[PDB]
């Protein structure tokens, strides 16, 4: 009845829903199923625990980005190299995510119709609010009470309350808040258990969010892949989809995949859900091209792969005047949602700045030793606690406008092991973001002076935040879009896209929650038709 490609949070949910509805489902998974226990030990064994893709081996048949060292699986060109990362394995990229469950603020859903830049959504916030909550109820998300205004109107409160903040995050929260209320530093909404929830456990400050929770305390796509199989959904691990086949009713009738060997297989279904990631979903589309649709299925708009977006990050690291001991609790619980909105957003982009609660005794110890000067164990320890306690780091999400010149196309030369053309991404960062980062740097310098910073280091290199969006743009008409407001494709009735690719604007936050909601949206949609 329903054939879901990709077992990432997106597809996982869809499978589960229709699986519950008593519908026969097939979940197609490119990579293999890696169990919790195995992943952790790989990490615990890795020399660099700042490489969050390391403990996830890129299976030759289903390869993915790896920068330790560079496996160059991505062909990058343009002004800025789109060095993002995803995880091809049963459970999706939510295996290594930070579990930061943020809502898009109303104005995000009407950028051009308000600031006159980018593009509007075919839907408005109030349309996704009821689903937003259902997404917070399925994932299990803790978040502040009314007292803290997240500027996303809530019909109902969070299903869980947030555990106390880390001494580090509570100190810097108060320090800045009392300085300027405009910074508006608040408790971050996240999919972390503040109490035994969904049959899972509660956070115990493993401080390992990225690259992985060894308990399940926080949400991992796998949770629904499980619930999915238990509903009756037939999951096929190591089924890398490469082509989609159509019928005269410009409808999709089957999808073909290669197993570990490279042996092509065919899967026939009634409805199709393209639940691959931001780079992989457009690759399959720009790969299933036939005489019926020369420009590639659901690509009559020629917008498939285009309008690719991801928050160009910018951080700052310094040594505070006071001890903070980053590492006691989750990696991130604080977020400076001050410049998420405002008029200027018609000139430079709005950014969400987040304080780093990651252990730095790993890094700081190394930094001392790199000096290469011998010291007695009293002076050594002295510097270890002095450095690792006073270390603070601020990273932020910048918003880049959806641009058609930024695209993901299957390279017409390079190819993967099983011989599938590998993603060739052409990305560049407009001045719209450059100006925003400029003022974003003035906030960093101030945050320093407030927290009595020393050895203040500025990271002015736009870092990838791994939020691939806009590949299969959403719109009103099919001449400048790919899917409608129902996440359905204009070209193919029974083809649905459940990925950040459908998101017109990237906004100022992490998109996963937005994705999970849109997923549940379709679930009710597909559930009425079939």
């Amino acid at each position: 009845d329903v054939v879901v490609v990709g077992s990432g949070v997106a597809g996982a949910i869809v499978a589960h829903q229709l699986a519950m509805a008593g519908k026969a489902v097939i979940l197609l998974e490119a990579g293999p199923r890696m169990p919790r226990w195995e992943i952790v030990e790989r990490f615990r064994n890795q020399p660099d625990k700042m490489d969050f893709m390391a403990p996830y081996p890129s299976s030759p048949w289903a390869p993915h980005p790896e920068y330790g060292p560079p496996n160059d699986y991505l062909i990058l060109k343009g002004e800025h190299k789109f060095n993002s990362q995803y995880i091809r394995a049963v459970g999706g990229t939510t295996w290594h995510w930070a579990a930061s469950a943020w809502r898009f603020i109303p104005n995000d859903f009407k950028m051009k119709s308000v600031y006159g830049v980018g593009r509007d959504w075919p839907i408005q916030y109030d349309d996704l609010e009821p689903y937003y909550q259902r997404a917070e109820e399925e994932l299990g998300v803790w978040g502040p009470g009314p007292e803290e205004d997240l500027y996303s109107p809530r019909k109902q409160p969070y299903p869980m309350p947030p555990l106390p903040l880390s001494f580090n995050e509570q100190t810097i929260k108060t320090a800045l808040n009392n300085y300027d209320p405009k910074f508006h530093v608040v408790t971050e909404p996240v999919a972390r258990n503040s109490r035994p929830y969904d049959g899972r456990p509660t956070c115990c400050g493993n401080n390992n969010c990225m690259p992985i929770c060894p308990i399940g305390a926080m949400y991992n796509g796998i949770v629904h892949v499980e619930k999915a199989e238990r509903a009756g959904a037939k999951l096929i691990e190591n089924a890398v989809v490469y082509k989609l086949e159509t019928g005269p009713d410009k409808r999709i009738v089957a999808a073909l995949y290669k197993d570990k060997t490279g042996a092509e297989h065919r899967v026939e279904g009634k409805y199709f859900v393209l639940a691959a990631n931001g780079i992989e979903t457009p690759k399959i589309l720009l790969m299933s091209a036939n005489r019926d649709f020369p420009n590639g299925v659901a690509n009559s708009s020629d917008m498939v792969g285009r309008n690719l977006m991801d928050h160009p990050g910018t951080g700052v690291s310094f040594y505070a005047s006071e001890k903070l001991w980053p590492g006691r609790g989750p990696q991130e619980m604080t977020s400076l949602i001050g410049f998420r909105d405002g008029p200027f957003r018609a000139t430079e982009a709005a950014k969400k700045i987040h304080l780093s609660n990651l252990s730095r005794i790993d890094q700081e110890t190394q930094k001392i030793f790199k000096a290469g000067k011998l010291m007695k164990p009293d002076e050594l320890d002295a510097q270890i606690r002095d450095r690792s306690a006073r270390y603070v780091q601020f990273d932020c999400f910048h918003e880049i406008l959806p641009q058609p010149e930024n695209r993901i196309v299957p390279s017409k030369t390079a190819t993967d092991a099983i011989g599938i053309p590998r993603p060739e991404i052409t990305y560049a960062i407009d001045d719209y973001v450059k100006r925003g980062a400029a003022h974003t740097r003035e906030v960093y310098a101030t945050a320093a002076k407030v927290l009595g910073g020393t050895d203040v280091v500025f990271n002015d290199e736009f870092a990838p935040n791994n939020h691939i969006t806009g590949s299969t743009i959403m719109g009103a008409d099919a001449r400048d879009s790919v899917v409608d407001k129902d996440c359905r494709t204009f070209d193919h009735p029974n083809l649905f896209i459940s990925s950040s690719a459908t998101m017109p604007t990237v906004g100022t936050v992490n998109v996963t929650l937005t994705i999970a909601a849109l997923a549940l949206r379709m679930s009710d949609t597909l559930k009425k038709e079939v």
Binding site: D362, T365, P377
Partner: protein, 117 residues
């Protein structure tokens, strides 16, 4: 008197810690050297220079390595030890270590109890 007792008591001298696991100390030992003894020796010769007057330049480089081996837990870019890594237990009172839960949920609310102060 095996090339291991020398190392252990040479390590306690540099690390300034007592009760180091000889199980780890041997692994560090193996990795510090090759399949060789050239490293297993000169240890006694070092212990004398250290626990006395001035140290010869390249006699320092040897110490510095033994330190890193114990604290960082990685030698030649290979993880020999992570939990027992000495850098993680110098502010303890309750060991942190990334990938392991110290105490319980709310543990990170109140101010950490700085050690040797």
């Amino acid at each position: 008197t095996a090339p291991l007792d020398t190392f252990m008591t040479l390590s306690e001298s540099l690390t300034g810690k007592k009760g180091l696991s000889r199980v780890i100390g041997e692994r560090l030992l193996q990795a510090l050297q090759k399949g060789s003894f050239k490293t297993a020796d000169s240890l006694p010769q070092l212990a004398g220079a250290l626990a006395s007057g001035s140290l010869t330049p390249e006699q320092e480089s040897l110490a510095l390595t033994i330190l890193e081996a114990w604290y960082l837990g990685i030698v030649d870019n290979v993880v020999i030890t992570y939990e027992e890594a000495l850098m993680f237990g110098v502010v303890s009172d309750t060991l942190v270590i990334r990938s392991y839960c110290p105490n319980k949920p709310g543990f990170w609310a109140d101010k950490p109890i700085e050690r040797q102060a």
